[PDB]
Amino acid sequence: GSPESADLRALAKHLYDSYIKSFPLTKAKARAILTGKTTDKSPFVIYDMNSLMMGEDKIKFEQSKEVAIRIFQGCQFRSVEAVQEITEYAKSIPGFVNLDLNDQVTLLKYGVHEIIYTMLASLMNKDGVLISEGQGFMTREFLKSLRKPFGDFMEPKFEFAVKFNALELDDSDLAIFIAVIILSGDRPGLLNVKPIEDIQDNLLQALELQLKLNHPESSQLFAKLLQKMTDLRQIVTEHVQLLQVIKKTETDMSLHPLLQEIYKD
């Protein structure tokens, strides 16, 4: 009834406010930069090797390693930063910090990359990706051009992003969507699934009401977002497969200890 609905809107707002606190660059700010509607300094565009060299100081997060490997390493540190932000966000979801601590770890271990790819879409258009909190823009063609197989990592994320961004979700919608994904009761090795699904069920009701109110003309948007959750799991599976290739092909790659924990399978 209306009392439940009001509580769902208060939960949606709490999540939005926590999302704003956790993530430095929101979708609204990212899209303004991408569409060129900001007053702030323009991102440095990296579209070829010359511009990467020039722009390197603008986009920094010494270097004799080959460029594809250097981009690979830099990406880990950005990914590790994202894990930290997502963990802060998860701790703001009501009920999360009261879960068994090993289950909180499990939820982050198996959920964080699905969230990374969701939030990465906010930074992407069909032509490239905003990097370094808006200070750079690396073209999709440049990343595709990196020597095999490094040029294969980002393209499926761009493919996901263009379709995902066509749904026109805003930061308020995204805050609930990512909370739903974190609270997935089917992650391997969860010790107590029922409290997780109880939280998720309430988040799913908050998401459905959010979409009905914020996107009244977008038919079955909720069903579309449930399908995107499945699509994100496929992106993760494919990314892991590519990592296995690099591990078998490339000689001495240093994997960050936080990613070592996450990818310990």
Place this chain on the structure above:
Amino acid sequence: PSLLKKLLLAP
């Protein structure tokens, strides 16, 4: 030895 657990426990 869990880095995720350390992140979760920091207020």
